[PDB]
Design a protein around this ligand. Structure first.
Ligand SMILES: Cc1cccc(-c2nc(Nc3ccc4[nH]ncc4c3)c3ccccc3n2)n1
Length: 285
């Protein structure tokens, strides 16, 4: 695997690890030996039984590569020329149909992650914990696939047990004020929903008349905001990304979804499955 891959271009970096475009085209994330725990954990999540799905980054393999001086810890995946949704939305505007495709595919991927699949070759429910436009990738066919599962948590339904991290800007209210129950898997699922809502906001702005690209809370917090800065806005002032006045039926549906993803109480939010259904219906209309 790694033995026969030739790196060609530096294309980014994760929380840990540098991302490269290589030829085996494939994407490669390289970690140093001191980052073994992060490398292993993400490898572990990607190797979960029945995890593969069209809206989840396609994992190829985890490997080691000794260059003669030091050993590199590798994770290899499919390569998508468009890269992140973040980059995609900055570079282009989208049609109503394109917006629906991006939102539906993301929701379909999160629903798959959240969904426990019962059976001999079953899949446990999984919560992402760091969903953002920067780790969702856009495929050539206009659909998304979710990446970086290194902070994910897996649920054992038989015992309701699992096996402050994350991107500040996208942290759920309960995470920002630390009221979230770290022992309650469902709470992590709900927190993902809040984040996906913000992502939907980023996409809707680009649906073209249209708004320029912006990260959520762009006009309320500084870049690389701290937990406190976020908490004051989201928890104390209780603000959420602004919903433009103009409206289209599709955009109206999106906005409603957003609002229902932004409740301070996770238990009040919509589920990924419900969002997928609603988006599916809209796509048909
Ligand atoms: C498990 C794994 C293997 C390889 C790369 C990543 C990865 N990639 C990111 N970015 C990225 C950028 C452009 C791309 N084109 N085709 C694929 C692709 C991937 C990440 C960005 C943020 C956090 C983690 C990432 N992990 N994860």
């Amino acid at each position: 695997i790694a033995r026969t891959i030739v790196l060609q271009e530096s294309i980014g970096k994760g929380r840990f690890g540098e991302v490269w475009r290589g030829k085996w085209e494939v994407a490669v994330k390289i970690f140093s030996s001191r980052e073994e725990r992060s490398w292993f954990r993400e490898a572990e999540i990607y190797q979960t039984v029945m995890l593969r799905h069209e809206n989840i980054l396609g994992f190829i393999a985890a490997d080691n590569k000794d260059n003669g001086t030091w050993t590199q810890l590798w994770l290899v995946s499919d390569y998508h020329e468009h890269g992140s949704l973040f980059d995609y939305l900055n570079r282009y505007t989208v049609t109503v149909e394109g917006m629906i495709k991006l939102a539906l595919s993301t929701a379909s991927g999160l629903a798959h992650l959240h969904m426990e699949i019962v059976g001999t070759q079953g899949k446990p429910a999984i919560a992402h914990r760091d969903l953002k436009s920067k780790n969702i990738l856009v495929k050539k066919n206009g659909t998304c696939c979710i990446a970086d599962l290194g902070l994910a948590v897996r649920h054992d339904s038989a015992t309701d047990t699992i096996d402050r991290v994350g991107t500040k800007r996208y942290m759920a209210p309960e995470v920002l004020d630390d009221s979230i129950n770290m022992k309650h898997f469902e709470s992590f699922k709900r927190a993902d929903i809040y984040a996906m809502g913000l992502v939907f906001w980023e996409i809707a702005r680009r649906c073209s008349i249209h708004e320029d690209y912006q990260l959520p809370y762009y006009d309320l917090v500084p870049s690389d905001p701290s937990v406190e800065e976020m908490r004051k806005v989201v928890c104390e002032q209780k603000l959420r990304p602004n919903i433009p006045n103009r409206s289209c039926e599709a955009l109206r549906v999106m906005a409603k979804i957003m609002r229902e993803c932004w409740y301070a109480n996770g238990a009040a939010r919509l589920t990924a499955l419900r969002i997928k259904k609603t988006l599916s219906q809209l796509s048909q209309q």
